[PDB]
Amino acid sequence: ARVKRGVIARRRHKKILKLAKGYYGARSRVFRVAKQAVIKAGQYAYRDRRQRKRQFRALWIARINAGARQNGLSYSRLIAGLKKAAIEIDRKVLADLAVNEKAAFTAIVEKAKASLA
Amino acid sequence: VSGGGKKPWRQKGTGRARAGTIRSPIWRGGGTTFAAKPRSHEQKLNKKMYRAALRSILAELVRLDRLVVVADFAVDAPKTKGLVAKLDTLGLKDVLIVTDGVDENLYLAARNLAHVDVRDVQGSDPVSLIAYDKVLVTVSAVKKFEELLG
RNA sequence: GGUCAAGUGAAGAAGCGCAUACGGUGGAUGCCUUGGCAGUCAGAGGCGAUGAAAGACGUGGUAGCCUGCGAAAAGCUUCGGGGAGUCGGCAAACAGACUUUGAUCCGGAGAUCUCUGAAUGGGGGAACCCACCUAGGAUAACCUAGGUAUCUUGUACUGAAUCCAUAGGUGCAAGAGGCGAACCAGGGGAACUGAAACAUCUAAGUACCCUGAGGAAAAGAAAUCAACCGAGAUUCCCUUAGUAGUGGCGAGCGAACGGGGAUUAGCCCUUAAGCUUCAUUGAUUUUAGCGGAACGCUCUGGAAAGUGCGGCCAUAGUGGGUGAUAGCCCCGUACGCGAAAGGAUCUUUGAAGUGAAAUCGAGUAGGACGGAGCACGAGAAACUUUGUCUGAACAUGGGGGGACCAUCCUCCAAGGCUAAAUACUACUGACUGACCGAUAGUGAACCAGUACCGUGAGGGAAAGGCGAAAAGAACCCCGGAGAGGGGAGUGAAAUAGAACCUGAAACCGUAUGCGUACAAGCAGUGGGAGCCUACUUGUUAGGUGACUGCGUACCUUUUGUAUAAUGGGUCAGCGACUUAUAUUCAGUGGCAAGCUUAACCGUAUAGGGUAGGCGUAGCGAAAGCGAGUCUUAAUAGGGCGUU
RNA sequence: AACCCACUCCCGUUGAAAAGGUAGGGGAUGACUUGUGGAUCGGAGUGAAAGGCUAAUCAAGCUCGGAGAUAGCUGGUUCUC
RNA sequence: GGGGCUCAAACCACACACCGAAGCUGCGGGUGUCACGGUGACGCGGUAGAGGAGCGUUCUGUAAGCCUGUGAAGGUGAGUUGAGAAGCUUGCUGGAGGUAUCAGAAGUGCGAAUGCUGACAUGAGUAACGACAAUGGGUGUGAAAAACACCCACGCCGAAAGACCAAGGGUUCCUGCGCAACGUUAAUCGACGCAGGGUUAGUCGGUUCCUAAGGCGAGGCUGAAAAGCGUAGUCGAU
RNA sequence: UUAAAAACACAGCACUCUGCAAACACGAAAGUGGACGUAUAGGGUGUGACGCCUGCCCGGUGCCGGAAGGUUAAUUGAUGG
RNA sequence: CUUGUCGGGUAAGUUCCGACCUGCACGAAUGGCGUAACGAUGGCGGCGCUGUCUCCACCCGAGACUCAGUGAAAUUGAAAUCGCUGUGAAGAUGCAGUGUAUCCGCGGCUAGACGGAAAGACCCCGUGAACCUUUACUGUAGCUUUGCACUGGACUUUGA
RNA sequence: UUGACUGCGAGACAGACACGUCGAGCAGGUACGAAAGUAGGUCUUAGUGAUCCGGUGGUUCUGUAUGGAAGGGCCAUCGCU
Numbered sequence A: 001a002r003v004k005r006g007v008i009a010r011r012r013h014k015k016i017l018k019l020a021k022g023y024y025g026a027r028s029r030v031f032r033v034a035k036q037a038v039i040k041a042g043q044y045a046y047r048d049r050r051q052r053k054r055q056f057r058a059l060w061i062a063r064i065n066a067g068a069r070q071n072g073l074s075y076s077r078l079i080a081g082l083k084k085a086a087i088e089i090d091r092k093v094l095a096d097l098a099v100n101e102k103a104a105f106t107a108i109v110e111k112a113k114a115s116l117a
Numbered sequence B: 001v002s003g004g005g006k007k008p009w010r011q012k013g014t015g016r017a018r019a020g021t022i023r024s025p026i027w028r029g030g031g032t033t034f035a036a037k038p039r040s041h042e043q044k045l046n047k048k049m050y051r052a053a054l055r056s057i058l059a060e061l062v063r064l065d066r067l068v069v070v071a072d073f074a075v076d077a078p079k080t081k082g083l084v085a086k087l088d089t090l091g092l093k094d095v096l097i098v099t100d101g102v103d104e105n106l107y108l109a110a111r112n113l114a115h116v117d118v119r120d121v122q123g124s125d126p127v128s129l130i131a132y133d134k135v136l137v138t139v140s141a142v143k144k145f146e147e148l149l150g
Numbered sequence C: 001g002g003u004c005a006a007g008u009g010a011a012g013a014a015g016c017g018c019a020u021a022c023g024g025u026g027g028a029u030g031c032c033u034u035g036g037c038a039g040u041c042a043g044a045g046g047c048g049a050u051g052a053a054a055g056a057c058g059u060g061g062u063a064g065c066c067u068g069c070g071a072a073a074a075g076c077u078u079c080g081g082g083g084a085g086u087c088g089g090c091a092a093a094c095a096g097a098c099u100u101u102g103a104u105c106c107g108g109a110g111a112u113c114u115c116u117g118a119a120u121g122g123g124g125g126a127a128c129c130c131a132c133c134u135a136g137g138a139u140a141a142c143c144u145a146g147g148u149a150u151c152u153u154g155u156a157c158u159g160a161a162u163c164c165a166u167a168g169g170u171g172c173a174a175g176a177g178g179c180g181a182a183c184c185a186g187g188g189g190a191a192c193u194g195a196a197a198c199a200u201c202u203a204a205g206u207a208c209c210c211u212g213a214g215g216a217a218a219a220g221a222a223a224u225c226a227a228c229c230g231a232g233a234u235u236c237c238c239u240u241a242g243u244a245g246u247g248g249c250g251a252g253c254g255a256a257c258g259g260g261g262a263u264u265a266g267c268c269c270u271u272a273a274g275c276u277u278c279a280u281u282g283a284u285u286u287u288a289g290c291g292g293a294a295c296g297c298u299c300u301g302g303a304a305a306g307u308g309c310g311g312c313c314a315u316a317g318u319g320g321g322u323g324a325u326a327g328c329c330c331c332g333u334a335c336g337c338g339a340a341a342g343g344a345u346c347u348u349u350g351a352a353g354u355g356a357a358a359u360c361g362a363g364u365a366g367g368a369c370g371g372a373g374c375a376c377g378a379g380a381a382a383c384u385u386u387g388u389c390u391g392a393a394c395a396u397g398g399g400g401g402g403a404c405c406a407u408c409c410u411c412c413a414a415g416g417c418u419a420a421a422u423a424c425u426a427c428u429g430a431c432u433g434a435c436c437g438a439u440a441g442u443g444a445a446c447c448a449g450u451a452c453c454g455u456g457a458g459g460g461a462a463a464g465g466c467g468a469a470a471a472g473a474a475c476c477c478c479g480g481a482g483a484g485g486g487g488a489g490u491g492a493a494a495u496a497g498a499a500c501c502u503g504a505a506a507c508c509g510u511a512u513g514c515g516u517a518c519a520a521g522c523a524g525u526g527g528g529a530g531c532c533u534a535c536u537u538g539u540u541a542g543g544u545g546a547c548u549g550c551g552u553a554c555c556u557u558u559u560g561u562a563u564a565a566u567g568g569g570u571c572a573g574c575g576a577c578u579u580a581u582a583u584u585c586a587g588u589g590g591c592a593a594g595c596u597u598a599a600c601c602g603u604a605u606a607g608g609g610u611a612g613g614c615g616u617a618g619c620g621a622a623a624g625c626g627a628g629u630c631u632u633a634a635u636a637g638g639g640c641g642u643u
Numbered sequence D: 001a002a003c004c005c006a007c008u009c010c011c012g013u014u015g016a017a018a019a020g021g022u023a024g025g026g027g028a029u030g031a032c033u034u035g036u037g038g039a040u041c042g043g044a045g046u047g048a049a050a051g052g053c054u055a056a057u058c059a060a061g062c063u064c065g066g067a068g069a070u071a072g073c074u075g076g077u078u079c080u081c
Numbered sequence E: 001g002g003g004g005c006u007c008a009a010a011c012c013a014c015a016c017a018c019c020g021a022a023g024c025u026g027c028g029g030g031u032g033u034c035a036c037g038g039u040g041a042c043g044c045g046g047u048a049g050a051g052g053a054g055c056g057u058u059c060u061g062u063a064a065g066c067c068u069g070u071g072a073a074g075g076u077g078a079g080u081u082g083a084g085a086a087g088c089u090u091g092c093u094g095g096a097g098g099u100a101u102c103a104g105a106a107g108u109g110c111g112a113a114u115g116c117u118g119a120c121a122u123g124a125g126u127a128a129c130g131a132c133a134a135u136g137g138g139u140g141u142g143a144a145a146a147a148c149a150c151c152c153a154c155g156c157c158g159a160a161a162g163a164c165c166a167a168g169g170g171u172u173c174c175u176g177c178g179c180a181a182c183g184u185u186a187a188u189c190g191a192c193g194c195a196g197g198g199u200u201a202g203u204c205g206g207u208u209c210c211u212a213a214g215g216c217g218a219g220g221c222u223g224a225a226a227a228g229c230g231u232a233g234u235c236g237a238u
Numbered sequence F: 001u002u003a004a005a006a007a008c009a010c011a012g013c014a015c016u017c018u019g020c021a022a023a024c025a026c027g028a029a030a031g032u033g034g035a036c037g038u039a040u041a042g043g044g045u046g047u048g049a050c051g052c053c054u055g056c057c058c059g060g061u062g063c064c065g066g067a068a069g070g071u072u073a074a075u076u077g078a079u080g081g
Numbered sequence G: 001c002u003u004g005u006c007g008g009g010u011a012a013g014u015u016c017c018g019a020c021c022u023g024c025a026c027g028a029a030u031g032g033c034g035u036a037a038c039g040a041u042g043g044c045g046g047c048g049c050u051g052u053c054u055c056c057a058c059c060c061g062a063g064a065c066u067c068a069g070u071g072a073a074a075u076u077g078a079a080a081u082c083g084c085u086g087u088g089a090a091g092a093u094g095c096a097g098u099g100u101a102u103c104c105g106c107g108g109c110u111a112g113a114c115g116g117a118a119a120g121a122c123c124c125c126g127u128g129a130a131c132c133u134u135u136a137c138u139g140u141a142g143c144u145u146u147g148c149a150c151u152g153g154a155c156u157u158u159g160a
Numbered sequence H: 001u002u003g004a005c006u007g008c009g010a011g012a013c014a015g016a017c018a019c020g021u022c023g024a025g026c027a028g029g030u031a032c033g034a035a036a037g038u039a040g041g042u043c044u045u046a047g048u049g050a051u052c053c054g055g056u057g058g059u060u061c062u063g064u065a066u067g068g069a070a071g072g073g074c075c076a077u078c079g080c081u
């Protein structure tokens, strides 16, 4: 029983070369270079699911700082004031109100201020 | 493999990978690494393990109603159509016929019949008893299984 | 609306990137096969001086090569078969013919059979040169047919030193010589390697070289083993047993007795079985052939063997191929018949020969020295054999029973012949394969031991596929009376067009969409505007990716590599833990104080065969004793073992 | 001078050439040079001796066998959880 | 680390707030072990290495089955399903084969070995085009002329770069017809392709006659065998 | 085929061996060379035209001569156990 | 030691020539000391001559350069392939910080890519290999001693 | 005066193995001491070398047809800078 490798080997190389679509030069058309490019792309994607959550908290916090100082308060003093009174609203929701619903953000900043913080 | 007695090139200095023979298994026309030789595939089965499987098969054939017992089964003159009519009375098409001794006439018929085999008590193996849809046995052959199989 | 100023900044790509669509190159993959590989069952096991194996040259209606033949040259004569086409293939055309008054074709027996080659009349650089003798025929400068090597054996004649007769010399007959894959019996005989170095030892009496024989060979009928009971020639298989031994007692080597089988057989020197060669008596096979059953309609289709419906044959039903898948279309198959003439085998009965050595074994048995062989390496070392040197007895005698002696037992050496069971396959036929399928399988599917390489010995490739059928593209146009194309035709299909099935990847292009000329690095990824396309007209799908956060390839080797340490230009194909025999442990089964057979028979995967192996008892170095035993003066102690 | 040789420079070094070329150099009646044919070879030959030469190969030629020598050493070793 | 920093954005004390990991919590999934009868509990980084469970390829049985010209294998896109190796369904191409399920058997899975064979890239349209005797016009032919033929001039060799024997080669010789490949460019030309033709001996050279070095060598002598040496003899030119 | 030399050879010199079937060399051997030679010859070794010369040591290791004594092989086999 | 010391030659002489003797470590056929002629032999010094040089300039041919035709090679993981100062398998185009900088050719030069080429030849290791030496070990061809055989007769000396 | 004894040995310490170290108690025979008792060398820790092979003294073993013997086993002991 002699087994020939032609059909199975070709099917396996085409799966890798389809994931390497859009890469530059030999990274999208030769198997040896495209195999390493696909592995490193998956290494980056695993790490950047952690970094996506970090990059978005930093963006919300920076926008909350800009909106609070327009009402006479810094970010660190507003967070302490919110925790003092009641509020559990996310940084994600807070950054949305700072840009879109500016009259609601002012009310929250004014209530956090009234907690003497 | 023929040829390949000498080194293709000297060991050092040519800038090529080391070679000792052109008939290497890594080369195009070279030999097979673990080439085969004619060997035997034949296991040992205990005499009693063989009989225990026959008892197990025959017991299951009765439970599944795939065994038909008749009082003697003989035909006169070798004619395939003579046997086909006889088997049609019992309503069997794919059948194994077991008798205490294979008659010449019954062997000459059923030789060209497609899904019919005529065997003997000592000639019927575990595979044939499972392969066919029905087994036809005579009372004289049933007595013969009891002596052989206890 | 005008001028001025400040701000802002679309489009415009020499060329590149990604995506998609079409091509090109290239030849993978799939499917296929006139070629290989390994077996089983048979055959017959040699050819050659009556000229072999192997060749050169020639031979055809027309050039070459392959096949066949040999100046009578793809053939001549006879028998036997058949039953209409034929003049071999690559490889086609044009011609000339052959014939039911029997061709081509197949088988048996004949005839012819150049030159070289053991090559054989003498030479020689193989395929060439030069001769002599006899018989017959021509008259010119020869023709035809036979002879002429060497050695051995036998025979006839002849005859040196030398009288005799010896060596020698001529003539007749008979034989040999050379080739061949293996098997067999002999002569000569390594090393690498292992011993984790290496001398003894091993590898191994292997590889290799040489010489003889045969279809087999060799060996074979006890001066053999056993053990006080017996067996009964030789050969081969399975066990005894990796035991007793042997061994720098290292690495290693390794029996026999006794059992189970295959085969069956002995006969002579007061002259036999047997074997050869003739002549006869019958039978059987081989070399060629002959007969050999049973199907129609319908649908799709270029074409049915496929769909649907109904039948028939069977000692013939998973054969091959026919326009796609056929028991009933063809060739076949089961089953029946067959041979003018050769071959072979077995069978009667007649002859000739051989066996054959004459008369029971003397330079023999035994011994001393040096070696070889026995599983046994000098060892307590028996036995066989012999290079050197010696050397008996005569059946009230001689050999052996592992130093040697005694007693018993058992054989009769120095003379022969003998089948079967056993080994091997270069070669021929049939059948088979959980073998390969064109980088595989033979090096070799194809004009391969070729092309090519080397002075030579020698080494040694690449290279398969149109289509069912050549129906292989008449004719027109561009072009050099080209190459190559555009039409037209053939075809089911020419993007099946001869470099012809399918036609992947690397690699190279054309077209369209988006991006790219102030911007620094493993080229990706998290986020993300804009533009283009499609339709569900935007919580959608596809293509691009301005800008921005992070981010120094893979393998190996290492304490540690982005490492400026190793490896890789890329693609496609191939490429590395197997098999046999002995074992131990685990899982899963069958039997169970028992379990299981090996060779071998076989009604052949059944059944038989229980010789043997393991278990049911241990202790001791052993004799031995035994649920005990060893140590010891010791039923004390202790070691090992026992429910 | 021819002929045999090979002292120097340069060029060439992927060469016109796997040892050459141009310009100079030595011997040139002799222990000379050369054609044809022949003899000696692998632990062997030959050597006015360099371990030189024996078919571009020499501190032991080439070829085929033992033979898949051996390699405590480098390299490589192929799907998934 | 840079910009920049002086009642600091330095240093010494004290205080309160915030940011900040794949740590912890929240929400949704998957798995290992143990206990109970699907729940509870705590685990789930990993090289050498040990243990467990699987995917896919070829062949054999199941299979005289089932699928298939209303289109098999293969190739090329799209969609979809699993934790993965992978599976499934379809458009186009292709034109005749494939193998469900569960078992059995392996030439069973490549990116590396300065791996082997074939094809194709980069260098790059870059180096080079082989003695630095040397060429310029006219005419003809032809699809096309720097190179072919002829003519008029110019250069080079001439103890050769001219003639002739031998060795070696083997048709390269001459003539018609050609230009794909060969010729380091083109070619109408050629030592290239096709087809014809061409070599005439008593005196030339061999053969025949003779021998040298040397070879072979009837008998012979020697040697485990193969064989060595050699006499008569007979080969061997230079 | 990176070394042409001071390296090798050389004429001359000396030592030593060899009486001819020579010493010596190639050959399991037959035989062949030396040599169809014969000590003014042949082999080996060193030195190296020519001139003047070549000194001391015989303890070591070689070679040559001696044969009294000591040691000493195969072989033989008294004696003892 | 050492470029010993003295003399000569030069403006200046580790080389050269002539001496001295303290010969690390000359020496008499592995010859000692001389020697005319000879040498593509080693060292030193003069005359002539000069692009050897100060210090290069111009000119002539063959390449290089451009156009037409034909058309290689080693190399190569993939490249969107800058400087500096640090860091770091310890000497960075690729990492950190920072500075510069529109995109692409052609003619030149070689500072780097630890540039290409050849599994370092130096060095060490392997219970590796060859070949060479000898008073290493164990053997052996050859040469030589003696016993027996081929191999006999007689006489004499002499031991038992 | 010979306890520098003979057969053992509960139990330990050390320790990859092969080796090593300590030892109450029992049985035989002893020596000292009136006796309880002490004694299996020396105040302790170095003074050493495996297996193979060969030799010597014993021996309820074996002993290749049988009775012996040779040879082997067991116990004691000898031969390694």
Ligand SMILES: [Mg+2]
Binding pocket: A003, A004, A005
């Ligand atoms: Mg394969």
Ligand SMILES: [Mg+2]
Binding pocket: A022, A023, C018
């Ligand atoms: Mg992209």
Ligand SMILES: [Mg+2]
Binding pocket: A054, A055, A057, A058
């Ligand atoms: Mg963050």
Ligand SMILES: [Mg+2]
Binding pocket: A053, A054, A055, A057, A058
């Ligand atoms: Mg965060």
Ligand SMILES: [Mg+2]
Binding pocket: B002
């Ligand atoms: Mg062959």
Ligand SMILES: [Mg+2]
Binding pocket: B005, B006, D064
């Ligand atoms: Mg070879």
Ligand SMILES: [Mg+2]
Binding pocket: B016, B017, B018, B019
């Ligand atoms: Mg190689």
Ligand SMILES: [Mg+2]
Binding pocket: B018, B019, B020, B021, B022, B024
């Ligand atoms: Mg090889």
Ligand SMILES: [Mg+2]
Binding pocket: B019, B020, B021
């Ligand atoms: Mg090899």
Ligand SMILES: [Mg+2]
Binding pocket: B028, B029, C439
């Ligand atoms: Mg091949």
Ligand SMILES: [Mg+2]
Binding pocket: B028, B029, B030, B031
């Ligand atoms: Mg092969």
Ligand SMILES: [Mg+2]
Binding pocket: B029, B030, B031, B032
């Ligand atoms: Mg192969």
Ligand SMILES: [Mg+2]
Binding pocket: none
């Ligand atoms: Mg059985």
Ligand SMILES: [Mg+2]
Binding pocket: B110, B111, B112, B113, B114, B115, B116, B117
């Ligand atoms: Mg049947």
Ligand SMILES: [Mg+2]
Binding pocket: C016
């Ligand atoms: Mg472009």
Ligand SMILES: [Mg+2]
Binding pocket: none
């Ligand atoms: Mg593009």
